Amino acid sequence: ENKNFVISISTAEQRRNHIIEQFTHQNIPFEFFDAFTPSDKLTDHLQRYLPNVANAAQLTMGEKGCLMSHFMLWKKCIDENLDYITLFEDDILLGENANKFLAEGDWLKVRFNFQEIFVLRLETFLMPVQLEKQTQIPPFQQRDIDILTSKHFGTAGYVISQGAAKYLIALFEKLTTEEIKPIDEIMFNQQINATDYRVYQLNPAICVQE
Template sequence: MILMNINFVISLVNANVRRSHINNEFSKRNIPFQFFDALQPSVLLEQYIATTLPGLKVANLSEGEKACFMSHMALWEKLANSKNNYMAIFEDDVILGKNADKLFSSYDWLEERFALNDNLIIRLETSCIAVKRVGSEVENVLERKFSLLDSEEFGMAGYILSRKAAVFLLDYFKSLDGKSIKAIDKYLFGDLIRNNNLHIYQLEPAICIQEDKLNKKKSTLISQLEYDRRRIENNNKKQENKGIIYMIYKLLTKWKRMKEKKRSEQERLNNMIKFE
């Protein structure tokens, strides 16, 4: 039997709008949860990094990304040191889908499908990009299947992990070279999907999604973290001196790029993980 509570929502202590959103999302479905006060750039965070993941100090990440990284690691430590077999971790801009109350109010379905000694991670969300996945033999739950990721996904807005997986991840990240450390989701749902020591599943259709992915231009919960990530990635790109020949080439090949863009969008729609 799984002990409660295992649903945690990472949220800044002063994020009143986001906390109100989460209270509404979970409470209207009678899903038990607890806020976990997200770490913020501070002396306290620097001390925690120094004792837990020293290499993160020199990583090419924004201070917000480092705080996000360590907030997730803090919850993994909490799980590793607890008597619970699993933990569900959400971020405070998540929107829940159909039958979320049945999935997150009781976790007996996990023990019915997976061994307690599994290094198990179940991704619950979709980032609405084209992603490759393959089928698994795990029994469906509430008309949702368990696929195995076969290409990179993004985001950490909703996932479940086992206590054994938490222990593995803590050891894994401590072994990384600091300068090569990337955003945490690029490991969990990127580099690690082919690690033989982990079983990383995708719940499909996804049962949660970030609010700005669902509402797009009408979003009320814009992600500052995503903005910071894109800014750093853009700064890392080499600026090239593009002359007149390049500009003519771009003009002459515009039709080809438009055609490719349309094809890529159709591919994304055909291969993205649906949310419901």
């Protein structure tokens, strides 16, 4: 049964073509998941599963769509009782030998207990954006006063266990409107060190976002 899903807007024809070309070339089975966009489908799904996220001003409707797409794929994993599911965004470039990781699950089956709670990053480890410049407050002694953020950690390529699929559905359903952040900031920053939640990194990575 199919484990590799590529999150793609249904009308993103060129991106879908570049994905099909690369996956076909390395004989890696996959399906598209039709990414949520500003729509009634997104609005109703947010209301059905994440009304806490529907009310969150601090997320753009694009960021809300991204989170809903990943969420529904965590649901699919539970519903089909898959051991794991592997999720990509449609702007990824596969490395040579990605098929050694992405065609077969045996290397996962001999390393992992799928009831345990883990994510394995397949995408390159990304340094967050941290210093934003601002003009409101003037510099002093030729040093700037920047704003601190931690943004864009990347959700474009990871394996998630059934255990972590359950864990993350519950987490995003649990969080108050004030606690909501973009999916990447929770999955790959805030929840790191949490009790029983492990994130692994394939080094070197087997794909990267364009």
